[PDB]
Design a protein around this ligand. Structure first.
Ligand code: AKO
Ligand code: AKO
Ligand code: MG
Ligand code: MG
Ligand code: MG
Ligand code: ZN
Ligand code: ZN
Lengths: 325, 318
């Protein structure tokens, strides 16, 4: 019976606002596995790339295991949400037939691994505390390099190489695209990434069929980079009952980092002091300075495919603002 | 004795192989020690001389003695070459004492724990290093990580009496410098050096913002990394012998694995002399001529020796 209800909920996999928390509960805290498996079936990726079903499940379960269940936001539910949001963004009409199967596989795989083994603290916290991760990665995209290294390493575990039947050229291309995509999820690259997306929007070319014209790697990877970045920053664009749960979880994570910064005599990071935080004003500023500028630009790139998502974002911003006065 | 040769530490063409032999295979230590005294670094930064020695020894130990080129003698050579370039007249005290310390420390660690194979080899063999570093400046990220981690060994933190902000600043400059020694970044680096030359301002060089000053320091250590063909011929020839030995050993590993043999790495199909002339024509002379322009004309004798050495190598080709 519980499997039947889960199957009903997975019928929403192509919809923005999938009940991802319900799916995590109904799947036994396996949202990343079941949503990834569902999307691979939906896009015929097992047949296209000759991925053994048992190998796919084994990798997904291992990958999902390496997300921290004790981190409130950057956990396997977040990963599953970014995977499913990227899957929906890949289906946008303005991009129909634009990307190859290998690029679709790269974008979805990158989304699945993009936060694996996240410890629930920021890059700056890891740098400032002289963590082994920051020492390993020379303070440069510390978390994001780590997510990549773990996500690829787990392919080497027993019956986990889901890319075993790709050609060597296919594997090499996929690996580079996945690295390029996950490194672009570093928030310290957001401004430069949005600047380039804006440049592409103002110089955008479309084909005779009306889809976006991307005729070189730089343009192609930049669209996939911004797509996964939008998916990563998609919480305020979702139905409010989903958005508010994400806000609760990120604030829990922030406050826990602030508690450790406080116990260390460090200056507390912005939005991380539970004694002097405004959750509502922080969301309004997050939308106003980061999320709406990004999604407004994405919406321009794929116009008018994303108008409903942009409208939800604007409604939710009005709602969070309305709770301030 | 060893003290005799060390007095040339301020001279281009120091006898680093003799120093390496006379010092019991500790050229990096004794040359780093000597350079710190020459610049007054142990007192400028309150470095306990024993802590300096303990770190430098541990660092030297992490260079591989069985790697023919990228070993502790190479590290010593780049340290001393950078040291000399820091005293270019056109750069009179242009860098702060921390920027000086960062360039020298970066030089000393810039190849530590080098396995004697290229980044591309590590990528194509699915090495643990390339998996860790996502195929991006694999060696250079590792050199930095090792160089910094060794500061955490007992009595090895030579920066213990730097302030918190001095450490953070030094760390960033060292990382920026060592990452720029990746040879895949050479062309972008040269373009920035050229731009700086075409827009140079002078009284002596006037570099106002960090971005220009880190670029000079990056191209400086890059020059010191690529200085072998600008040294006296007797030193240059020993460097050529060592790099070709390391290249051929990589090409043998590529052959025993049946992978494609890297350029200049096929011992059954390599012209050592033509490779050197091509190396100078396409890489070393463009870089050192651009640098010579920047410090016009304080690099004249270095550019002269390079052109002398290129002529000699060309004359060995029938
Ligand atoms: C649901 O809500 C959130 C979700 C997320 C964040 C913040 C949220 O809410 C404040 C932060 C963003 C941090 C951040 C980086 N630069 C910024 C600049 C500004 C102005 C504000 C925030 C940031 N994340 C951290 O992993 C991503 C997910
Ligand atoms: C003494 O001589 C050498 C010393 C060194 C090298 C090559 C030497 O001699 C052929 C190579 C340079 C790699 C390289 C990158 N692009 C190139 C293009 C050309 C044309 C040649 C070489 C290179 N190194 C390897 O770590 C640095 C030291
Ligand atoms: Mg992340
Ligand atoms: Mg190197
Ligand atoms: Mg100034
Ligand atoms: Zn994320
Ligand atoms: Zn070197």
């Amino acid at each position: 019976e519980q499997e039947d209800v889960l199957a009903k909920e997975l019928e929403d996999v192509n919809k923005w606002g999938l009940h991802v928390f319900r799916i995590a509960e109904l799947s036994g805290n396996r949202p990343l596995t079941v949503i990834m498996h569902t999307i691979f079936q939906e896009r015929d990726l097992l047949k296209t790339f000759k991925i053994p079903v048992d190998t796919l499940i084994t990798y997904l379960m291992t990958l999902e295991d390496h997300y921290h269940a004790d981190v409130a936001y950057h956990n396997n539910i977040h990963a599953a949400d970014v995977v499913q949001s990227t899957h929906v963004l890949l289906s946008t009409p303005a991009l129909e037939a634009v990307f190859t199967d290998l690029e679709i596989l790269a974008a979805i795989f990158a989304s699945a691994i993009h936060d694996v083994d996240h410890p629930g603290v920021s890059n700056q916290f890891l740098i400032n505390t002289n963590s082994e991760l920051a020492l390993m990665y020379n303070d440069s995209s510390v978390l994001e390099n780590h997510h990549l290294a773990v996500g690829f390493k787990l392919l080497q575990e027993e019956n986990c190489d889901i890319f075993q039947n790709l050609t060597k050229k296919q594997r090499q291309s996929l690996r580079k695209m996945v690295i390029d995509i996950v490194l672009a999820t570093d928030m310290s690259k957001h401004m430069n990434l949005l600047a380039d997306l804006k440049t592409m929007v103002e110089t955008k070319k479309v084909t005779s069929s009306g889809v976006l014209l991307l005729d070189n790697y730089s343009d192609r990877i930049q669209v996939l980079q911004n797509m996964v970045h939008c998916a990563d920053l998609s919480n305020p664009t979702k139905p409010l009952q989903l958005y508010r749960q994400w806000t609760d979880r990120i604030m829990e994570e922030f406050f826990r980092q602030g508690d450790r910064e406080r116990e260390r005599g460090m200056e507390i990071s912005p939005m991380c002091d539970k004694h002097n935080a405004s959750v509502e004003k922080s969301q309004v500023g997050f939308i106003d300075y980061i999320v709406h500028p990004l999604w407004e630009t994405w919406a321009d790139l794929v116009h008018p495919d994303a108008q409903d998502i942009l409208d939800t974002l604007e409604d939710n911003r009005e709602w969070y603002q309305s709770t301030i006065p």
